Swiss-Prot record:
Species: Homo sapiens
Included stretch of the parent chain: 41 to 105 of 142
Phenotypic consequence of residue 24 to S: Affects import and stability of CHCHD4 in mitochondria
Protein's UniProt name: Mitochondrial intermembrane space import and assembly protein 40
UniProt-annotated location(s): Mitochondrion intermembrane space
Cystine residue pairs: 13-15, 24-57, 34-47
Gene Ontology terms describing biological process: mitochondrial disulfide relay system; mitochondrial respiratory chain complex assembly; protein import into mitochondrial intermembrane space
Signal peptide: none
Domain CHCH: 21-65
Top-level taxon: Eukaryota
Length: 65
């Protein structure tokens, strides 16, 4: 699926790599890696600061990429 054979996230498939591609893309990558390695259940449950960061970044940066 979306996880590499080395346990990291597969940053080259179109949609998942595309949202990881850009300046706010580092926060998207940090939000997803924190959530994936935490395995808890709810999308971002103990990683919330990186999802809030993704929001403040991308609500200022729309299509200028």
């Amino acid at each position: 699926g979306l996880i590499l054979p080395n346990g990291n996230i597969n940053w080259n498939c179109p949609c998942l790599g595309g949202m990881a591609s850009g300046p706010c893309g580092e926060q998207f990558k940090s939000a997803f890696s924190c959530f994936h390695y935490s395995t808890e259940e709810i999308k971002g449950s103990d990683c919330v600061d990186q999802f809030r960061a993704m929001q403040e970044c991308m609500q200022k940066y729309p299509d200028l990429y």
